[PDB]
């Protein structure tokens, strides 16, 4: 029982930390997409402003 | 369990940091597109202004 218990806990922490680390860096990805697509829209309509 | 755990966490951080770094620089891409397509529209209708 405890054998396949640690089996199951690791086996699911597997498909867990997978999507988890993917989430980490897809998130910091959108973080800099934010900082950037900011300066995109921020000055598109700064020239179009004028 | 912990073996395929670190497997899964890296395997998903893979498809994560992929879209993440793509997001980084597609974002800074639109950032300068912004600074530029600004000066595009900013003076199209500066001559058309006149």
Swiss-Prot record, chains A, B:
Subcellular location: Cytoplasm; Nucleus
Post-translational modifications: Phosphorylated on Tyr residues after EGF stimulation.
Cysteine pairings via disulfide bonds: none
Subunit (UniProt): The vault ribonucleoprotein particle is a huge (400 A x 670 A) cage structure of 12.9 MDa. It consists of a dimer of half-vaults, with each half-vault comprising 39 identical major vault protein (MVP) chains, PARP4 and one or more vault RNAs (vRNAs). Interacts with TEP1. Interacts with PTEN and activated MAPK1. The phosphorylated protein interacts with the SH2 domains of PTPN11 and SRC. Interacts with APEX1. May interact with ZNF540.
Domain notes: MVP 3 mediates interaction with PTEN.
Function: Required for normal vault structure. Vaults are multi-subunit structures that may act as scaffolds for proteins involved in signal transduction. Vaults may also play a role in nucleo-cytoplasmic transport. Down-regulates IFNG-mediated STAT1 signaling and subsequent activation of JAK. Down-regulates SRC activity and signaling through MAP kinases.
Protein name per its UniProtKB record: Major vault protein
Annotated organism of origin: Rattus norvegicus
Residues of the full protein shown: 711 to 760 of 861
């Amino acid at each position: 029982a405890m054998s396949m218990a640690v089996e199951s806990t690791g086996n699911a922490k597997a498909e867990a930390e997978s999507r988890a680390e993917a989430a980490r860096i897809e998130g910091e990805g959108s973080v800099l997409q934010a900082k950037l697509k900011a300066q995109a829209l921020a000055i598109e309509t700064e020239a179009e402003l004028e």
